[PDB]
Amino acid sequence: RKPPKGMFLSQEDVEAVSANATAATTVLRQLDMELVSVKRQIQNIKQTNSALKEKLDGGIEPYRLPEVIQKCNARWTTEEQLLAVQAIRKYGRDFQAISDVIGNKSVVQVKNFFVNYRRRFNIDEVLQEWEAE
Amino acid sequence: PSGVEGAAFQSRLPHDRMTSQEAACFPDIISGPQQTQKVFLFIRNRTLQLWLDNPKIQLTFEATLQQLEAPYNSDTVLVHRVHSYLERHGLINFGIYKRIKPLPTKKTGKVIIIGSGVSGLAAARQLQSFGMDVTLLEARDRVGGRVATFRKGNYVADLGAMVVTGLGGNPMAVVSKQVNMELAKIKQKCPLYEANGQAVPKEKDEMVEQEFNRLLEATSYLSHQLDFNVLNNKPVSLGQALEVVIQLQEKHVKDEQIEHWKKIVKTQEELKELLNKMVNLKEKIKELHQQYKEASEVKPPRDITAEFLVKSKHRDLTALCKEYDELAETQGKLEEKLQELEANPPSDVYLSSRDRQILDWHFANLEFANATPLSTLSLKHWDQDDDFEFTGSHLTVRNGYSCVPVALAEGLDIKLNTAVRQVRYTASGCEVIAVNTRSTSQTFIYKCDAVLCTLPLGVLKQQPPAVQFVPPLPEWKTSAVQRMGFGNLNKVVLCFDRVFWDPSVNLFGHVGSTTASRGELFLFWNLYKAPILLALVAGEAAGIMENISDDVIVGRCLAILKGIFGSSAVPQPKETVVSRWRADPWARGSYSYVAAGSSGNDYDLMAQPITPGPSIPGAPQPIPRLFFAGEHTIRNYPATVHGALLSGLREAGRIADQFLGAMYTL
Ligand SMILES: Cc1cc2c(cc1C)N1[C@@]3(C(=O)NC(=O)N[C@H]3N2C[C@H](O)[C@H](O)[C@H](O)COP(=O)(O)OP(=O)(O)OC[C@H]2O[C@@H](n3cnc4c(N)ncnc43)[C@H](O)[C@@H]2O)[C@H](c2ccccc2)C[C@]1(C)N
C-alpha cells in the first residue's frame, strides 16, 4: 500500500528519473546547482544584514526620554484647554495621543472635552482642518 | 507442526486440503462429499507419518493397513489407492531404504537417463523400484554432477552444493536419516571487513544492512504497486530498479536540503526588511530627539504653542521609541529562529563512499544467492520461490555432500565417461547416441522406450549444441531455454595446517574497493573440522575470475586474509582448489535464475515432456517419449539439490504412469 519508512518513491518521480539514459544525472545536477545557488544567496543576505546590524549599533539609548509620572487630574486649567485644542489640530481623533500631550488627563476625559467645549472651541472646524492634511 | 498434520507439512502438502495432483488421481473423492475427503486426507497424512517416522525401511500397503484404525481401515481399496499414489509419486519409499519385497524377477520397459546428478539418480532409483530397466549415461568419471566434493587426505570441501537449506519440509531431511550425513548448523553472524582489513563498526554494519533491506522492499513496491516492470520495451531488472530507487533517495536528500536552506532565506529576508525598517526608524528618532531638544532649549516663560511643541514632540518621540522596542522584540525572535534552523540541518548525503562500498557487499551477497549479476534478474519474479522456503537452521554437510549421490548410485547401471551426443525419439521408440570421453571415436547406441534428460540448462543452452535432438526440440521448449537464466558462482578452497581465524565464526565478509569487483572474494566460510577456509566469487567477478590462474587467485585470497588477521598469522596454504563452473563443459554454469523476461512459468515449460509425430501418417497420437528433470525444471524449488531430487521423483512417477499404467486412478 505504501513505501517503506525512510524511503521516498512517487509515480511522478520514477518517470522523471527513468526518462532517458542520463535523466538521472540531469535531475541530480539541476538540484546540485540549485543548492549552490541558494547557499551563496544566503551568505549574500547574511552579509547585507551584518552591515545593517552595525548601523544600528548603540540602539536608541541616547534618544530615550525619562518617564514622566504624573497623577490624573479632574480640573481643566486654561493651559490644558489650550494644549488640547492644539492637540486636536495636530492629531484629530487619536484620544490616546491627545491624552499623552496634555499629560494629566485620561482618555475618557479627553472624549468628554470634545462634547463639553464643543461649541466654545469650534472643535468641528478644528477637526475638519486636520482632515484637510 | 506435529502428528499427522506435521507429516503433511514435512511433505510440502496442505494437511486439510486436497492438492491438484490428488484431484487428478482421485476425482471421485474430491468431487464427492466432504466426509470422504477428510477420510482420504487422514489416510494420506497417516501413511506419510508412518514413512517419515521410519524412512530406513520400505512401507508396504500391508504394513500401512495394519496400523490404520476404524473407520479409516474399513475401505481397503481407498487405502490401497492412496498408498499406491504416494509410492508412485515418491512421497513414500524414496531414497535409500531396505526392501521387504525383493525387486521383481523381470523388468518392464526400458529407460535411458542422461546424466547421473541428483535429479538423474533420484529418478533412476524410483524407476528401478517400479520394475523398469534403467541405464544412466554420465559424461563425468563420477556421479553427483553439481554435487562435487574435493577430497585429499583429511581435507574435505564441497566445490558444488554444500548447504541443506533447512529441514522443515525438506526431502533431504529424509535422505539425511537414510545416509550418514554429518549435518552441522551455520551460525548467522557475519562480521564484515573493509578493504583496509578492519571491521565495520556495529554502528554502520546495521545502518547499511537496514538500508539494503529497505532498498529491496522498495523495489518490490516499485514492481507491485507502481507497476514499473517494462522500460523501453525491455523488461526491468532488479539491478535497474535498485539503481532507480537509490537515485530517488539521493534526490530526496537534495530536495530536503533545498527546502531547508529555502526556509533560511525566507527568514533571513524577513530580517532584512525588519532591519531596514529599524534603520529608518532610528533615523527619524535621531532627528526627532534633536527637535525635542531644541524645543526644550527655549527657556521659560513661553506661550502655549511653544509649550505645546515640547509636549507634542515628547509624545511623538516616546511613540516612535515604542515601535522600535517592538521591532527589536521581533528581531530577537527571528534571530534565534535562524540559529534554530542552522543548528539542525537535514542529511548531508544519502550514502558516503564508505557506505556505498558496504552496501555493495550486500548486493554481492544477493548476487551470490542468485549466482548472477543483479542486472540479469527479473524484477517481478526473481524471488518467486520465497513462499516455499523451508523452516529451520541451514546446515552444512560436514563429511562432503558427495556421500549423497554416491549412496543413491548404489545398485544402478551407470555408464561413466559416456558423453551423449544425440537424442533420437520417434513414435516407436528412442535411440541415444553417446561416445567415450577418453577416445571420442568409440561410439555407443542405446535403444529405449523413453529418455529422461537431466542435462543442465547451461548444456541445453549451448550454441552450437553439444547434444543434438532428432527431431529438433519444439520452439516452445527452445524459447524457454533461451529465456531462462543460467548463472555462475565459484569457490576457492584453502587448506591450512592451523586455524588462524575465529573458530566460533562460520562466515565473514570482505568489502571490495569498487562496485565492479564487489563479488570478488567477498565471503569466506569456516565450516569443516579441518582448518579449511572457503572463498566465494560472485556476480560479475565470477565470470572474469575464471580467466585468471589459481596462483593469482590464491594470492589475492592470502592478501585479504593477511589484512584481516595479520601479515604473519596467515601461512602458505598446503592444498588449493578453484572451481570454474562456467568453463566446465558438463555444466556451463552453476545453477538457474529467473532472468528478466522470464518467469516461473518457464520452469513448467522445461518440465513438459515431448511427444513425437506419428511414423505412418494418420496413425494414432503417440506416447510421450522425451522427459525432462533437473534443477531448472522445478518451479517451486529451482537451483537446489532438493529441487533436483524432487524433479527426479516427479518424472519417475510420470514415466511409470505412462509405461506401467496407473492402477490407482480407478
Ligand atoms: C554449482 C553450485 C550449485 C549449488 C551450490 C554451489 C555451487 C557451486 N550450493 C547450493 C547448496 O548449498 N545447496 C543446494 O541444495 N544446492 C546448491 N546448488 C545447486 C545444486 O548443486 C544443483 O541445483 C543440483 O545439484 C543440480 O542437480 P541436477 O539437476 O541433477 O544437475 P547436475 O548437473 O547435478 O546433473 C546433470 C549431469 O549430467 C551430466 N552431463 C552433462 N552433459 C552431458 C552429456 N552430453 N552426456 C552425458 N551426461 C552429461 C553432468 O556431468 C551431470 O552429472 C546452494 C544454493 C544457492 C542458491 C540458492 C539455493 C541453493 C548454495 C551453494 C553453496 N551455492
Side-chain angles (χ1 to χ4, degrees):
Chain A
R1 281 281 148 270
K2 281 180 177 180
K5 263 66 193 285
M7 208 67 42
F8 296 82
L9 322 150
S10 69
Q11 184 59 248
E12 192 189 327
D13 286 7
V14 176
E15 297 176 41
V17 174
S18 62
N20 61 73
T22 44
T25 332
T26 295
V27 168
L28 291 179
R29 272 203 191 97
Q30 250 83 121
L31 304 179
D32 261 9
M33 285 185 72
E34 265 275 354
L35 183 75
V36 170
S37 167
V38 173
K39 209 169 181 184
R40 72 156 152 257
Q41 192 182 179
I42 273 154
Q43 280 187 129
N44 194 259
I45 300 168
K46 211 172 187 183
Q47 192 96 45
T48 293
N49 288 2
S50 183
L52 286 175
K53 273 173 70 187
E54 206 197 317
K55 290 191 177 190
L56 285 172
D57 193 51
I60 53 161
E61 296 311 305
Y63 309 99
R64 258 184 192 82
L65 306 170
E67 186 74 66
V68 182
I69 313 156
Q70 58 179 305
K71 292 174 185 181
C72 193
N73 197 292
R75 284 174 175 264
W76 287 87
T77 74
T78 306
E79 172 189 25
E80 292 156 356
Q81 294 176 29
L82 290 158
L83 290 175
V85 167
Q86 294 184 80
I88 297 167
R89 180 59 188 82
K90 197 188 166 69
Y91 301 99
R93 278 170 202 89
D94 190 353
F95 311 115
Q96 181 54 32
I98 298 178
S99 170
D100 294 335
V101 166
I102 302 164
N104 69 342
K105 295 288 173 292
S106 63
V107 198
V108 60
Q109 283 174 322
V110 173
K111 288 202 280 181
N112 279 242
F113 185 95
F114 272 84
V115 197
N116 300 317
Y117 300 89
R118 183 180 159 90
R119 283 189 172 182
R120 285 176 291 169
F121 291 147
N122 301 64
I123 309 181
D124 290 356
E125 288 183 333
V126 182
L127 282 161
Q128 76 186 30
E129 287 209 320
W130 172 77
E131 288 159 358
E133 285 190 17
Chain B
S2 68
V4 286
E5 294 171 47
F9 168 82
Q10 186 55 45
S11 293
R12 308 148 299 274
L13 295 163
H15 70 94
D16 54 31
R17 199 176 70 260
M18 285 183 72
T19 67
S20 192
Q21 193 173 189
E22 290 165 338
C25 302
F26 304 86
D28 52 302
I29 291 156
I30 191 158
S31 65
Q34 283 288 325
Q35 185 51 45
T36 325
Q37 294 184 36
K38 290 181 187 176
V39 179
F40 166 83
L41 291 166
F42 184 89
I43 293 166
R44 176 250 269 168
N45 298 331
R46 183 74 183 104
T47 312
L48 289 164
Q49 187 178 35
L50 290 158
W51 160 249
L52 291 168
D53 289 343
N54 197 3
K56 270 194 263 66
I57 57 156
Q58 185 190 358
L59 182 76
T60 62
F61 162 67
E62 284 73 26
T64 305
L65 185 62
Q66 183 64 40
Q67 276 147 119
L68 266 160
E69 298 277 54
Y72 307 112
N73 70 343
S74 65
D75 193 346
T76 55
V77 291
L78 183 55
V79 178
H80 194 72
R81 281 175 74 193
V82 167
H83 181 277
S84 298
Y85 161 87
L86 295 176
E87 188 173 30
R88 178 53 56 93
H89 299 112
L91 286 165
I92 66 168
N93 310 302
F94 67 88
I96 301 135
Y97 50 99
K98 275 188 186 174
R99 205 164 296 272
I100 304 170
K101 321 175 190 291
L103 291 162
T105 168
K106 253 158 271 190
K107 294 160 159 56
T108 310
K110 168 67 180 191
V111 189
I112 286 292
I113 300 179
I114 305 173
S116 69
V118 173
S119 65
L121 290 161
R125 279 211 148 242
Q126 290 294 98
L127 293 164
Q128 177 175 94
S129 302
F130 305 153
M132 296 199 82
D133 197 299
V134 178
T135 296
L136 299 86
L137 310 184
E138 179 54 54
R140 295 182 203 273
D141 54 15
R142 55 161 190 94
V143 288
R146 279 171 279 175
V147 170
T149 301
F150 171 69
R151 289 180 196 268
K152 202 160 184 179
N154 306 325
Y155 301 128
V156 171
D158 286 295
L159 294 161
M162 188 166 60
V163 177
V164 179
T165 65
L167 303 180
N170 194 336
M172 295 311 297
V174 176
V175 181
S176 66
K177 285 183 176 179
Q178 298 176 335
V179 196
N180 184 31
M181 287 178 83
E182 206 176 330
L183 293 184
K185 295 180 183 186
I186 309 161
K187 281 171 185 166
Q188 295 290 317
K189 206 193 87 176
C190 186
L192 314 182
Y193 298 86
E194 290 162 65
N196 64 13
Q198 284 193 311
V200 179
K202 307 205 174 194
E203 266 277 318
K204 267 180 171 59
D205 199 19
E206 286 176 36
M207 281 172 172
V208 186
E209 183 158 338
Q210 193 202 178
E211 202 61 30
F212 164 69
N213 296 319
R214 272 177 177 166
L215 287 164
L216 268 185
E217 283 177 56
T219 52
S220 183
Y221 177 86
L222 246 71
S223 177
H224 301 103
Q225 308 289 146
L226 297 173
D227 205 9
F228 182 67
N229 289 302
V230 181
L231 189 72
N232 309 125
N233 297 38
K234 302 216 288 286
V236 180
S237 69
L238 183 60
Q240 277 184 216
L242 283 158
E243 220 154 24
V244 166
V245 169
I246 286 176
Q247 285 157 355
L248 268 68
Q249 298 319 288
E250 286 176 335
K251 186 214 177 188
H252 172 81
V253 157
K254 296 181 198 295
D255 278 346
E256 282 285 286
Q257 281 180 353
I258 278 173
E259 64 115 47
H260 166 265
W261 297 107
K262 209 192 195 74
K263 268 182 164 70
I264 289 171
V265 286
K266 200 182 185 183
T267 307
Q268 204 88 217
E269 224 166 66
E270 269 188 29
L271 201 74
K272 194 199 178 181
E273 282 214 342
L274 199 76
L275 295 175
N276 267 0
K277 187 179 255 66
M278 283 177 70
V279 153
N280 283 6
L281 207 69
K282 189 194 170 166
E283 198 75 339
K284 281 186 178 178
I285 284 167
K286 201 247 197 169
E287 186 188 316
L288 215 282
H289 176 83
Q290 179 55 44
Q291 290 179 14
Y292 166 90
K293 208 77 179 184
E294 283 170 352
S296 291
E297 318 291 67
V298 182
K299 291 270 89 67
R302 46 205 184 196
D303 73 16
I304 204 61
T305 60
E307 196 71 36
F308 172 70
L309 193 71
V310 180
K311 300 282 187 65
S312 150
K313 299 288 166 179
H314 192 278
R315 189 226 86 85
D316 295 6
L317 196 56
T318 48
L320 296 183
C321 286
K322 192 91 272 175
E323 281 187 26
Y324 187 94
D325 288 347
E326 287 177 12
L327 266 51
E329 176 73 33
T330 305
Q331 190 203 344
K333 284 182 177 179
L334 304 175
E335 215 169 349
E336 69 179 357
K337 195 185 176 184
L338 285 168
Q339 287 189 46
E340 167 77 16
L341 303 171
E342 284 180 333
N344 44 273
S347 300
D348 191 9
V349 282
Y350 174 57
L351 294 166
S352 71
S353 291
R354 204 165 175 263
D355 293 316
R356 178 60 212 249
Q357 285 171 332
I358 302 163
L359 182 67
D360 269 343
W361 182 99
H362 287 270
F363 288 141
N365 196 237
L366 188 65
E367 281 178 337
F368 142 69
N370 296 274
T372 190
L374 299 179
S375 49
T376 65
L377 287 162
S378 176
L379 175 59
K380 198 183 279 177
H381 306 288
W382 78 271
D383 65 327
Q384 59 89 48
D385 59 299
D386 257 56
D387 301 51
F388 310 100
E389 196 191 346
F390 301 138
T391 72
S393 290
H394 291 200
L395 307 97
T396 59
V397 191
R398 219 146 183 249
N399 58 325
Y401 218 150
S402 78
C403 73
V404 171
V406 169
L408 291 169
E410 196 203 23
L412 294 171
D413 187 32
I414 304 152
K415 310 295 170 205
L416 300 173
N417 303 288
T418 314
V420 172
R421 284 271 221 269
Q422 191 173 114
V423 182
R424 291 185 148 260
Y425 55 98
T426 52
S428 50
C430 302
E431 46 188 309
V432 179
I433 313 141
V435 306
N436 182 53
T437 52
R438 295 158 286 190
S439 57
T440 69
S441 61
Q442 185 181 347
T443 302
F444 292 91
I445 302 285
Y446 297 93
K447 301 277 165 67
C448 55
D449 295 296
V451 188
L452 180 56
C453 176
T454 89
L455 293 165
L457 178 65
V459 169
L460 294 173
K461 276 177 174 292
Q462 274 199 238
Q463 224 57 237
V467 178
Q468 202 198 357
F469 289 93
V470 183
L473 292 182
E475 122 78 36
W476 64 260
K477 176 76 68 170
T478 55
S479 291
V481 171
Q482 277 163 43
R483 278 198 305 272
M484 284 187 61
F486 199 66
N488 183 25
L489 87 88
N490 281 304
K491 298 178 173 190
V492 188
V493 174
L494 301 160
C495 298
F496 304 107
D497 46 312
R498 59 210 174 195
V499 180
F500 61 79
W501 49 91
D502 194 329
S504 60
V505 168
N506 279 138
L507 60 154
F508 60 88
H510 155 267
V511 176
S513 292
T514 337
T515 303
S517 73
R518 68 192 182 195
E520 183 170 324
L521 307 166
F522 83 102
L523 179 53
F524 290 76
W525 295 73
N526 155 62
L527 307 162
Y528 301 106
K529 317 149 201 171
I532 309 157
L533 273 187
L534 220 142
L536 262 50
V537 188
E540 300 280 28
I544 301 164
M545 289 290 285
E546 288 198 14
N547 291 341
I548 288 157
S549 70
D550 304 311
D551 294 325
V552 180
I553 296 171
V554 179
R556 298 183 186 185
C557 273
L558 297 168
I560 291 160
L561 295 167
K562 285 179 193 303
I564 299 165
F565 298 99
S567 201
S568 56
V570 184
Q572 278 298 118
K574 295 288 151 65
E575 292 292 339
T576 57
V577 199
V578 179
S579 79
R580 281 175 186 76
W581 286 109
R582 188 68 79 194
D584 188 351
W586 315 127
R588 293 260 177 268
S590 69
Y591 47 82
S592 81
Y593 67 86
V594 193
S598 185
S599 78
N601 190 246
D602 275 347
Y603 291 84
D604 282 343
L605 291 169
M606 288 311 299
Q608 280 296 301
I610 312 287
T611 301
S615 283
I616 319 97
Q621 179 78 58
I623 295 96
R625 294 287 185 189
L626 181 58
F627 303 81
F628 297 86
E631 173 271 305
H632 57 293
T633 64
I634 189 155
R635 182 192 193 121
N636 293 357
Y637 312 86
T640 60
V641 162
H642 55 264
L645 189 294
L646 286 170
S647 68
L649 307 186
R650 182 198 64 230
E651 291 312 281
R654 166 148 47 184
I655 289 162
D657 273 11
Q658 184 68 242
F659 293 96
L660 307 172
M663 316 294 188
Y664 54 87
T665 44
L666 280 83

